[PDB]
Design a protein around this ligand. Sequence first.
Ligand SMILES: C=C(/N=C/c1c(COP(=O)(O)O)cnc(C)c1O)C(=O)O
Length: 382
Amino acid sequence: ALADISGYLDVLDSVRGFSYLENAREVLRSGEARCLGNPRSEPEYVKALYVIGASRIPVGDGCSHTLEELGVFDISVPGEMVFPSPLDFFERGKPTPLVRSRLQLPNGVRVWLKLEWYNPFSLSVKDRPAVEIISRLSRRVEKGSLVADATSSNFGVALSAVARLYGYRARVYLPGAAEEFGKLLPRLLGAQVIVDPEAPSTVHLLPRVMKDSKNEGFVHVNQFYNDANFEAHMRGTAREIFVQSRRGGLALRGVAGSLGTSGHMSAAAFYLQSVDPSIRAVLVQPAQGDSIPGIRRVETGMLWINMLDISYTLAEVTLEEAMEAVVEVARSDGLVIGPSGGAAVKALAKKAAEGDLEPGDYVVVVPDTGFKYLSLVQNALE
Ligand SMILES: C=C(/N=C/c1c(COP(=O)(O)O)cnc(C)c1O)C(=O)O
């Protein structure tokens, strides 16, 4: 029949590698999953179902079940929006909103904005990998232990709140150019903060964090390499775009977004392209010389967007163009989005103007709120 997946999640601690994603892709492509005789004997298939958002798995001898039958489309949110704890609110208070913009783009490209600031700890998309990452730790790593990572600002905040709710201590490392909220808010939340005014980037800090890890023995959760980041976005962000698009009546032709770790947009593109491989992924390339907070250029070794069978198209965006999009979204929708969000809107507008996109509905993932970036806002005004 069906069994509750929550009983089988130790496969998250034992499955390794990307091969399980073949099952994920096929179940999503076909719209259904085959019965697992002994579910414990097919740990890859079980992880595949978890990662696409199933809450139930098919077991025993018997027939295949559809995505809907596996819970992929179940409603989690209580309609009255009352929650017994902050973590329960994070988990069941989903999806994040998907809102049609009044901003007009060329060639029949209709914009919808997915507002990831609607996450309770960091007011950003980074809550999701923080929760998934800390959760995966929490029965191999003893309480009281120190966990740490490098961050542009958002993950550090998320990691600080979530580490403490799970009984861990945290430390976050930031580059000198990070926003003030990233430097300060983790201390509010009880974490240690190290700012390296030398470091020109978040990734530039990773050798130092690794070395301190070896010396001091804290757990480096490494969001740039930890697959729980990608997994969080498969079951959360990406599934939601899929479910929201079907249930909302959208003619989904593409998603648009930005890349730091590449975690959220790799998941969105991977998930959606499993269901329909023509769905586009338009991704921001910050123009050379420019810094758009939280994000960076593909070249390098970002993990998932390169290693996974993902189709995408890049558009160059300058910081000035990104902030101009912030301005225009604000004046069109009354919504105040962050620079990376503006950059994504602009990348979609550019591809739309070139004639490269089928008319239809396009989802832009807006990683956070522009309230956090006042000095960039001021510059953009003049
Ligand atoms: C790497 C981080 N942030 C990613 C981020 C991103 C990129 O998201 P992914 O790491 O999932 O690629 C986009 N926009 C903003 C405002 C962000 O903070 C961090 O907060 O450490």
